[PDB]
Write a protein that binds this ligand. Structure first.
Ligand SMILES: *[C@@H]1O[C@H](CO)[C@@H](O[C@@H]2O[C@H](CO)[C@@H](O[C@@H]3O[C@H](CO)[C@@H](O[C@H]4O[C@H](CO)[C@@H](O)[C@H](O)[C@@H]4O)[C@H](O)[C@@H]3O)[C@H](O)[C@H]2NC(C)=O)[C@H](O)[C@H]1NC(C)=O
Ligand code: HEM
Ligand SMILES: *[C@@H]1O[C@H](CO)[C@@H](O[C@@H]2O[C@H](CO)[C@@H](O[C@H]3O[C@H](CO)[C@@H](O)[C@H](O)[C@@H]3O)[C@H](O)[C@H]2NC(C)=O)[C@H](O)[C@H]1NC(C)=O
Ligand SMILES: *[C@@H]1O[C@H](CO)[C@@H](O[C@@H]2O[C@H](CO)[C@@H](O)[C@H](O)[C@H]2NC(C)=O)[C@H](O)[C@H]1NC(C)=O
Ligand SMILES: *[C@@H]1O[C@H](CO)[C@@H](O[C@@H]2O[C@H](CO)[C@@H](O)[C@H](O)[C@H]2NC(C)=O)[C@H](O)[C@H]1NC(C)=O
Ligand SMILES: [Ca+2]
Length: 595
């Protein structure tokens, strides 16, 4: 074993050991071991990393070197033969609204982020990789197979950069390579407030003692706030429409403007913070800016935890929920709350839940205009559609009235993401999210499918025949064997998502195991979990049990008709009720007395 303490985190840390508020970086959550779960630390390894040279080189790097006796198939080839399909008809989830997909992405970004390697401000490497597809140091190209149409119109590869790692970012020689998690492992709304003090600061409105988050000053949504714009140029959001020139938004998380619906969700939460903060000042006129800020923040963090654990996991894990996440019996300081490396791939099941279009609906939940339904790809890093095309209400109604895409063995990832993904850095709508995911497994030195099956105590198929029975699909099992020549080599992302779904769930057995464990840990390992005696009062907890995503929409948008259970498929107007019928968050329990 090697150094039990390498480390390039945010430096200076000193715990308050009486502070009723989480730190921004996640530090100090655990008392005996302060850095546990903090941002900018290595992702946890539940199993040893598997690299071509046992230390840092991904499998597929050295063409001649095999994995278990075989060549690992190209990411894009696996993408073309297994993940793609043409017919979007009949692909929608009959019982999960679009919000189901969307909330998952939110929880996801609150938990883990592995940014790519940074060594380019001045880089021509950013081009020796783009232009020539030359494999070298952190350039690990996604080569196009023979007969791939992109060869004819895009080039020879997709550029792709290895993820950052701990102890430098830079060159050489030590222990196995461990990727970084740039955000806090705890479900704490870090995505709204940021994971660095530096950013948490810039996001706040410190011009007034109200504890509000800064809002846009250039535009308004019917008197409702927008997230401030990011001042930094070049902006990708500006790029997709040189004429509208609208920048990306500035939020606690850098991926916020990835897609219009994710930016919509971010806006709702920022709105709830300021809403909470002003409602609190009304009750406690005495409280200062900091107190207003921390108490609202604390409330919002409880909201995310509650919606996630009460309404969202149950319908992901289905019958497996109880098997992995038992009833809460209290905080446990012996539990490692860190997000593991494999979790960040397991949680990518959501990619197969994204449909090809996004709609905007009007007050009666009718098409908003002539071009109400747009292709997903035209909305990547698209903020001008919100700002100069209706605000977020038409988008939010879409989230409630439309359905998520159903994971389907014959139709996995929509072409909008498989062939038209737009990356921050480059200029085309031609990347492949599926291939990227696959290349990224290898980059992260992930163990194979069967290593994880064994880890979860599940059978491990060694034969085509064995794979057919687990996957319950003859044809899918076959193309898989043809490309991988052995189950042991199947990349975890595609292997875990190819399994049939569990009863009342949306993921298979393997994924339910990987997801379930992770979630039980960040709950049980969180000293600030909302139900942990002492964090909130019994009276406060009674009030928080009433949160609902519907109420959230009611208090921060001009939608007045909403469903009671926002994550299940809901038809308008039968399943929609007036906001008055929806429980409000009673904040009197936060009222404070001096004398
Ligand atoms: C907070 O979470 C902690 C981390 O999970 C929990 O710690 C675990 O503690 C148990 C022991 O109490 C550890 O193993 C389990 O308990 C028994 C070991 O004493 C085992 O009993 C069996 O041991 C083997 C069989 O496996 C036999 O030889 C023996 O005769 C008996 O059958 C259990 O089967 C079980 O493994 C375990 O190492 C800890 N978990 C890990 C890996 O960290 C702790 O329970 C929690 N604290 C509390 C009590 O709330
Ligand atoms: C565009 C993208 C999305 C929506 C249109 C989208 C959606 C999701 C869902 C719904 C997720 C979970 C339910 C989910 C998880 C994670 N993603 Fe994904 N995602 C879009 C695009 C991307 C891109 C681009 C990446 C980067 C991939 C890379 O390897 O470089 C991406 C990643 C992830 C990810 C890992 C994050 C991390 O830990 O670094 C998820 C947990 N998504 N997305
Ligand atoms: C770049 O974003 C532009 C918005 O800044 C967008 O231009 C706008 O789009 C349409 C025309 O395509 C117009 O919106 C509609 O409503 C107006 C006025 O009510 C009508 O006059 C039109 O008929 C139209 O249907 C906007 O007026 C127009 N704005 C401007 C100033 O041109 C572009 O379409 C975006 N371009 C791309 C490539 O995405
Ligand atoms: C749509 O999914 C919802 C949400 O899971 C299903 O509703 C659950 O129904 C079961 C019946 O036992 C109950 O355990 C829960 O009360 C329900 N949850 C909620 C909040 O309603 C519903 O069955 C699904 N619709 C269909 C027709 O499958
Ligand atoms: C900081 O918060 C203050 C509110 O305290 C904002 O200033 C207000 O701005 C709104 C909109 O321009 C006006 O109705 C008020 O007159 C202002 N109120 C006061 C008391 O000045 C300000 O915009 C916030 N700053 C940022 C960047 O979001
Ligand atoms: Ca977090």
């Amino acid at each position: 074993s090697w150094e039990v303490g390498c480390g390039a985190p945010v430096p200076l840390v000193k715990c308050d050991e009486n502070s009723p508020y989480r730190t921004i970086t996640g530090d100090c959550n655990n008392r005996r071991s302060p850095a546990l779960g903090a941002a900018n630390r290595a992702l946890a390894r539940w199993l040893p990393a598997e690299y071509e040279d046992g230390l840092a080189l991904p499998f597929g790097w050295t063409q001649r070197k095999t994995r278990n006796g075989f060549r690992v198939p190209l990411a894009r080839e696996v993408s073309n033969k297994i993940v793609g399909y043409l017919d979007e008809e009949g692909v929608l989830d009959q019982n999960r609204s679009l919000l189901f997909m969307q909330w998952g992405q939110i929880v996801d970004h609150d938990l883990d982020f592995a940014p790519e390697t940074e060594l380019g401000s001045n880089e021509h490497s950013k081009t020796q990789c783009e232009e020539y597809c030359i494999q070298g140091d952190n350039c690990f190209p996604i080569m196009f197979p023979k007969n791939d149409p992109k060869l004819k119109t895009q080039g020879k590869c997709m550029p792709f950069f290895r993820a950052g790692f701990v102890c430098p970012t830079p060159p050489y020689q030590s222990l196995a390579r461990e990727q970084i998690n740039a955000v806090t492992s705890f479900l704490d709304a870090s995505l709204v407030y940021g994971s660095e003090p530096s950013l948490a600061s810039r996001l706040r409105n410190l011009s007034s003692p109200l504890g509000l988050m800064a809002v846009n000053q250039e535009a308004w949504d019917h008197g409702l706030a927008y997230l401030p714009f990011n001042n930094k140029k070049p902006s990708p959001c500006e790029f997709i429409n040189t004429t509208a020139r609208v920048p990306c938004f500035l939020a606690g998380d850098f991926r916020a403007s990835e897609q219009i619906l994710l930016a919509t969700a971010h806006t709702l939460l920022l709105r709830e913070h300021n809403r909470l903060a002003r409602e609190l000042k009304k009750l406690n006129p005495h409280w200062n800016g900091e107190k207003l800020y921390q108490e609202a923040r604390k409330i919002l963090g409880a909201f995310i935890q509650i919606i996630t654990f009460r309404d969202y996991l149950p319908i992901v894990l289905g019958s497996e929920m109880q098997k992995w996440i038992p009833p809460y019996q209290g905080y446990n300081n012996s539990v490692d709350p860190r997000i593991s490396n494999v979790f960040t791939f397991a949680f990518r099941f959501g990619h197969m839940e994204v449909p090809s279009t996004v709609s905007r609906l009007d007050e009666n939940y009718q098409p908003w205009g002539p071009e109400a339904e747009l292709p997903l790809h035209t909305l990547f890093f698209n903020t001008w559609r919100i700002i100069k095309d209706g605000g977020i209400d038409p988008l939010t109604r879409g989230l409630l009235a439309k359905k998520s895409k159903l994971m389907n063995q014959d139709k996995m990832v929509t072409s909008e993401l498989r062939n038209k993904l737009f990356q921050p850095t480059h200029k085309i709508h031609g990347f492949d999210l599926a291939a990227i995911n696959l290349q990224r497994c290898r980059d992260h030195g992930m163990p194979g499918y069967n290593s994880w099956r064994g880890f979860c105590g599940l059978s491990q198929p060694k034969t085509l025949k064995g794979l057919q029975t687990v996957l319950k699909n003859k044809i899918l099992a076959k193309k898989l064997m043809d490309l991988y020549k052995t189950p042991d080599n199947i990349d975890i992302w595609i292997g875990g998502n190819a399994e049939p779904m569990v009863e009342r769930g949306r993921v298979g057995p393997l994924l339910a195991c990987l997801l379930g464990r992770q979630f039980q840990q960040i709950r049980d390992g969180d000293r600030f979990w909302w139900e942990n005696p002492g964090v909130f009062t019994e009276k406060q907890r009674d009030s928080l049990q009433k949160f609902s995503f519907s109420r959230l929409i009611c208090d921060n948008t001009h939608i007045t008709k909403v469903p009671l259970h926002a994550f299940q498929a809901n038809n308008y107007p039968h399943d929609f009720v007036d906001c008055s019928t929806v429980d409000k968050l009673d904040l009197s329990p936060w009222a404070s007395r001096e004398n």
